[PDB]
């Protein structure tokens with residue numbers, strides 16, 4: 559398998575662009591930045607609102623939990639390569655403490671609105687607008703030869719007052735190289751594409767489009783997360799109960815993948831459930847024929863069949879968002 563778009567980006571760019579292990583980190587001054595308050599955390603980092611004591615401006619301080627040198631370099635190089643792109647979080651500095659050598663990444667600040675309280679209040683137009691803004695970030699990083707590999711609501715920061723979106727946390731991102739076999743232990747469970755769940759390792763940018771489709775399904779159907787598996791096997795079962803097993807079998811045969819017998823047993827046999835079966839009183843104002851058409855073109859087993867980010871942006875679902883921007 560190979561990407562249908564942007565496959566040669568790292569083939570044509572200098573090795574320095576993608577050879578992140580060759581990066582020499584130019585460490586800044588830890589004392590330039592002071593923690594104010596903790597705002598978030600995850601398995602790999604803690605995030606703090608901070609202050610730059612020179613200009614007394616706000617920043618975000620991301621203090622990394624212990625990680626291999628190779629992985630830190632990967633995140634840094636990717637952030638540097640993407641810096642300035644649309645809706646990409648901006649890395650401003652990189653520092654570490656003398657005694658323990660714990661690294662922190664310093665980012666621009668933004669007034670984030672918690673997705674768990676925000677999403678229930680989004681209107682139809684808001685969903686179209688924010689998904690379009692997220693697509694801009696994904697088409698950009700894909701065009702720069704990078705797969706994010708951890709798209710989920712927690713990694714999409716929205717300042718709802720300013721209608722400003724940023725795609726964050728590039729710690730799981732990778733450079734795309736045609737034919738490369740990648741680790742499938744990426745993404746949050748609920749956002750893992752079928753390729754990860756069946757051990758198809760030569761995946762590509764299209765992984766991010768499955769994750770995006772899961773977020774979009776969650777928004778329009780008011781179900782978060784949309785596919786709620788308890789472990790990775792159960793995750794595939796949840797997907798198969800919606801998309802049906804006929805399509806799964808076609809996909810597995812095309813890519814010459816055999817499921818672990820155990821997983822095969824758990825998946826069983828299921829008919830496809832039409833997207834309209836998910837409509838109800840709570841979500842009805844968000845569920846339109848354009849929304850369903852768009853969704854159906856993202857949530858496909860076969861990664862090669864999914865819309866690219868650029869194609870997604872031109873779908874008529876977003877026509878009003880494009881018209882507003884084009885003026």
Ligand SMILES: O=C(O)c1ccc(/C=N/N=C2c3ccccc3-c3ccccc32)cc1
Nearest residue numbers: 597598605618647665668669670726727728
């Ligand atoms: O990993 C990164 O790339 C990264 C980049 C930027 C940020 C910024 N985070 N900001 C805030 C945040 C994060 C998680 C949970 C809540 C909040 C929050 C609330 C108010 C204002 C800012 C933030 C994080 C990681």
